[PDB]
Amino acid sequence: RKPRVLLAASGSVAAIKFGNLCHCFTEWAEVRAVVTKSSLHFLDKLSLPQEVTLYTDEDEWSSWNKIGDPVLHIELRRWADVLVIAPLSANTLGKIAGGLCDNLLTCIIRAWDYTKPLFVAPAMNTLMWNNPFTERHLLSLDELGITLIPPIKKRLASGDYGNGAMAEPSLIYSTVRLFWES
Amino acid sequence: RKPRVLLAASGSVAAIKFGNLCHCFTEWAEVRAVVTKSSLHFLDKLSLPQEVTLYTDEDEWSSWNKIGDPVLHIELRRWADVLVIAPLSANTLGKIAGGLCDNLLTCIIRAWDYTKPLFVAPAMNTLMWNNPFTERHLLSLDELGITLIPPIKKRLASGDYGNGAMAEPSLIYSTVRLFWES
Amino acid sequence: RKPRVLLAASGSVAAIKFGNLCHCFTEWAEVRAVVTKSSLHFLDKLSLPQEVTLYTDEDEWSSWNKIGDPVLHIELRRWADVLVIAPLSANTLGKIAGGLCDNLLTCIIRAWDYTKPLFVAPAMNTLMWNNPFTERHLLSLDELGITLIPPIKKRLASGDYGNGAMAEPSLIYSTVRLFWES
Numbered sequence A, B, C: 001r002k003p004r005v006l007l008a009a010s011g012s013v014a015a016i017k018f019g020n021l022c023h024c025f026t027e028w029a030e031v032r033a034v035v036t037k038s039s040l041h042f043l044d045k046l047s048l049p050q051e052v053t054l055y056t057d058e059d060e061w062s063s064w065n066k067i068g069d070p071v072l073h074i075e076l077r078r079w080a081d082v083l084v085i086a087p088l089s090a091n092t093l094g095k096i097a098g099g100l101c102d103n104l105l106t107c108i109i110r111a112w113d114y115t116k117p118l119f120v121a122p123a124m125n126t127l128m129w130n131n132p133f134t135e136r137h138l139l140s141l142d143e144l145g146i147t148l149i150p151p152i153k154k155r156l157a158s159g160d161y162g163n164g165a166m167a168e169p170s171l172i173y174s175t176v177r178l179f180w181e182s
């Protein structure tokens, strides 16, 4: 009954389409959003659905004062039926592949119950995307079982035109929906 | 004559028992403590032994103004006969495995004279502990020669009950003591 | 006609010789500098050539306000014919090997067009240099095709005397020059 979907934004310029992405899921599922500090540089709070709760790192160090209180990264990991990171920056990709967790989003990933699906939609410039570490990290996510929603060939924020643009919201949406109903 | 023991705390909620941990070593050895910024969220200065000097990242960028001055992370690495990190967060674990050093504790580890013993007592939620990166990183520490003091099955700060709680101070203490006297 | 050389400084105490390093290149090439936040602890702006433009992380989040604006890390990657990091700290070395990018310098590396040469001059204490991760990371840079300019045996900022001091500016300069003219 109304699947819980955790949507997340990383520090990619593509984060400007995050509000719209949340809109694609709202009717179908109960949505909660998580963003990194850098994503707040491209994300516009008012562009998100009003029904969507936005969590930041500060929410981590606030929902807990003394033992016994809830641990947000754990609370969200449990609450969620699925996790979608769109966009996923090269930086966050590398932290995931490195087993690092220095913020709310990465802590959720580090404690992620892999029985639940986790989708990522990478977004970065072509050179960063073509860089060898990208494939290295993607290979790692595959091993973890994370599902990749490949970037498309659009007009990058850097003027040029090539691979690296984030997948379109509709595709991200249908991909997650088709899997769930399977 | 009175071994020098460097005790360290990472950003795990278990850091609340750090003062007590220092107490377990004070009589047997000369103790100096090192903590990460996040550990200061769970650590209570007044709970530590008065004879214990606490070093923070700020102490790094203070003991040095111009060439010729001492480099704290190096000064501590030399001073210490042994290093004990309890608790060791998943984040710090990953930085160690990644050869990273962006703070006092990690810089000490990065420059650690592995002729000297280094013990770690991991502390994190069960899912984070059960996460595949954990084992990956533990494997790396093993190669480096670091000694693992496994977490126990207690009642986590997240309410649930499972593996991931930090080893008890007494065990951490006896483990380090038994090795030394060998 | 006047090759574009991007010179970069990391958080090594050796960064105090960065201004002089820029001077070694100024006559031969058009120089632009990039520095990390920590490098600013050892770098003296007034010691650099006046003709040298210095870029910091803040320049990233300033040259861009809305879509369509230039992305500095990409703009610099394109502009540059070669990249030289001297000094390269153990921390930045590890971020490079980890495919991480959380600042201007690392983002440039992450998006680096490897058709262009990239040289690094590591600088760190002997123990950090002798640490096993160092070799591990150097091995990775080799695979990427990055050219290592080994550290020398001088008197470290830590008083002792051993390997780990940054290569001398003249050598860094001649190394880059000899390659270019080949």
Ligand SMILES: Cc1cc2nc3c(=O)[nH]c(=O)nc-3n(C[C@H](O)[C@H](O)[C@H](O)COP(=O)(O)O)c2cc1C
Pocket (backbone or CB within 6 Å): A009, A010, A011, A012, A013, A014, A036, A037, A038, A039, A088, A089, A090, A091, A092, A123, A124, A125, A157, C060, C061, C064, C070, C071, C101, C102, C103, C107
């Ligand atoms: C204008 C601009 C656009 C950027 N675009 C991207 C991008 O598309 N993908 C990416 O991975 N990083 C991009 N970066 C770099 C990231 O913001 C940077 O690596 C950051 O530390 C990522 O933070 P996060 O890992 O918390 O998301 C951009 C930076 C700026 C200033």
Ligand SMILES: Cc1cc2nc3c(=O)[nH]c(=O)nc-3n(C[C@H](O)[C@H](O)[C@H](O)COP(=O)(O)O)c2cc1C
Pocket (backbone or CB within 6 Å): A060, A061, A064, A070, A071, A101, A102, A103, A107, B009, B010, B011, B012, B013, B014, B036, B037, B038, B039, B088, B089, B090, B091, B092, B123, B124, B125, B157
């Ligand atoms: C209330 C709360 C409790 C936490 N408990 C743990 C824990 O037991 N183990 C862990 O590895 N991280 C834990 N985290 C996440 C870390 O604090 C976070 O990854 C941090 O960046 C670690 O910093 P450090 O690597 O400098 O220690 C907790 C966070 C909060 C807000």
Ligand SMILES: Cc1cc2nc3c(=O)[nH]c(=O)nc-3n(C[C@H](O)[C@H](O)[C@H](O)COP(=O)(O)O)c2cc1C
Pocket (backbone or CB within 6 Å): B060, B061, B064, B070, B071, B101, B102, B103, B107, C009, C010, C011, C012, C013, C014, C036, C037, C038, C039, C088, C089, C090, C091, C092, C123, C124, C125, C157
């Ligand atoms: C006085 C002093 C000197 C340092 N010297 C070095 C050095 O030679 N090499 C190194 O890798 N780190 C050195 N460190 C540690 C780095 O500054 C630290 O790892 C930092 O986070 C690196 O930042 P960066 O990766 O942005 O350059 C030193 C720290 C201090 C306080």
Ligand SMILES: CC(C)(CO)[C@@H](O)C(=O)NCCC(=O)N/C=C\S
Pocket (backbone or CB within 6 Å): A012, A013, A014, A015, A016, A017, A123, A124, A125, A128, A154, A155, A156, A157, A158, A164, A165, A166, C067, C071, C074
């Ligand atoms: C930015 C947007 C959403 C505009 O339609 C699209 O181009 C995109 O997703 N691009 C991928 C990231 C990027 O451009 N990076 C640029 C430098 S690292």
Ligand SMILES: CC(C)(CO)[C@@H](O)C(=O)NCCC(=O)N/C=C\S
Pocket (backbone or CB within 6 Å): A067, A071, A074, B012, B013, B014, B015, B016, B017, B123, B124, B125, B128, B154, B155, B156, B157, B158, B164, B165, B166
């Ligand atoms: C917190 C304490 C010391 C109370 O006795 C004990 O439960 C413990 O070491 N737990 C391990 C870490 C943890 O609970 N993480 C929770 C979420 S990441």
Ligand SMILES: CC(C)(CO)[C@@H](O)C(=O)NCCC(=O)N/C=C\S
Pocket (backbone or CB within 6 Å): B067, B071, B074, C012, C013, C014, C015, C016, C017, C123, C124, C125, C128, C154, C155, C156, C157, C158, C164, C165, C166
């Ligand atoms: C600092 C300088 C430039 C003085 O001539 C020289 O010794 C040097 O490059 N040393 C390498 C780094 C170092 O000393 N690290 C010390 C602790 S991590």
